[PDB]
Amino acid sequence: MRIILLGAPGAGKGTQAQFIMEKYGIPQISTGDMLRAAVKSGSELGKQAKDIMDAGKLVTDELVIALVKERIAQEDCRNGFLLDGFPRTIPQADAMKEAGINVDYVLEFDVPDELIVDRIVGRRVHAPSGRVYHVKFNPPKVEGKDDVTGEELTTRKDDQEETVRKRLVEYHQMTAPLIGYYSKEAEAGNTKYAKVDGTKPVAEVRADLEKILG
């Protein structure tokens, strides 16, 4: 089972990415996570991303499509995967079509622009695993520590009001058009489209997803 998460920044795609992963098995492919790992481990394929990311700008299609093509490669993704943060553009979406990468479901996480700044300013992550918390809306069992390894949590470098603003716009310019893209795919029968209310409580969106899938 292949799946795509599609939504504004802070819409809770990642938070939902974890669940589907542990409950269905399929690995979670988060471009942003890979970019941040690579940027930190100084990998050759990704380290370049650094300045762009911290600016709020999207990274060049070519670099990202590569990474994804390299990760889907792994044998863990032979039974399905979860593209969480990709595609982010028509080119990127197009590139997947030619490569013959079909998805079973496309899930649009609907969340208002006004809700975004506050979700994001209070988001903390366990970088090593990408596990994502929120100091108020979905905190850790122990303040400042990852629930599975007890490791200190951190705040993302690009998680600041200003950068979130720049981030929202690009979303509206480049990514947003994709809702239309997959709507059309869904209409042709190529995929299954599903919008869900991302303002609801985590535990609740979780159940909506479970209704949509199985």
Instruction: Name the pairing type of β-strands 131-134 and 82-84.
Output: unpaired
The count of residues interacting with ligand ADP (CB under 6 A) is 20
Q: Residues 2, 124, 131, 167: which is the catalytic one?
A: 167
Residue 127 in contact with residue 36, Cβ under 8 Å? Answer: yes
Span interacting with ligand ADP, options 86-94, 142-150, 177-185, 197-205, rule CB under 6 A? 197-205
Q: Which stretch in 7-15, 39-47, 152-160, 177-185 sits in contact with ligand ADP by CB under 6 A? A: 7-15
Asked if residue 170 lies in contact with residue 58, where contact means CB atoms within 8 angstroms, the answer is yes
Residue 158 contact partner, candidates ligand ADP, ligand AMP, none, CB within 5 to 8 A by sort of partner: ligand AMP
How many Cα neighbours within 13 Å face the side chain of 22?
8
Q: Is 117 one of the binding residues for ligand ADP (CB under 6 A)?
A: no
The Cα 174–Cα 178 span in angstroms is 8
Q: Are 95 and 65 in contact (CB under 8 A)?
A: yes
CA angle 29, 179, 67 (to 5 degrees): 25
87 is in an annotated binding site: yes
* 167 is a catalytic site residue: yes
Annotation marks residue 88 as catalytic: yes
Catalytic-residue membership of 166: no
Told to check if 11 binds ligand ADP by CB under 6 A, we report yes
**CA separation, residue 6 to residues 27, 39, 46, 78 (Å):** 17, 24, 22, 22
Is there binding between residue 138 and ligand ADP (CB under 6 A)? yes
- Among ligand AMP, ligand ADP, none, what does residue 138 contact (CB within 5–8 Å per kind)? ligand ADP
- Please report how close the Cβ of residue 10 comes to ligand AMP at its closest, in angstroms: 8
Residue with the shortest CB distance to ligand AMP: 32
CA atoms within 13 A on the CB side of 109: 30
Q: Which of 50, 71, 156, 192 is catalytic?
A: 156
DSSP conformation letters of 164-192: HHHHHHHIIIIITHHHHHHHHHHHHTSSE
Catalytic-residue membership of 131 = no
Active site residues: 13, 88, 123, 156, 167
Binding residues for ATP: 10-15, 119, 123, 132-133, 200
The binding site for ligand ADP (CB under 6 A) comprises 7, 9-15, 119-120, 123, 132-134, 137-138, 198, 201-202, 205
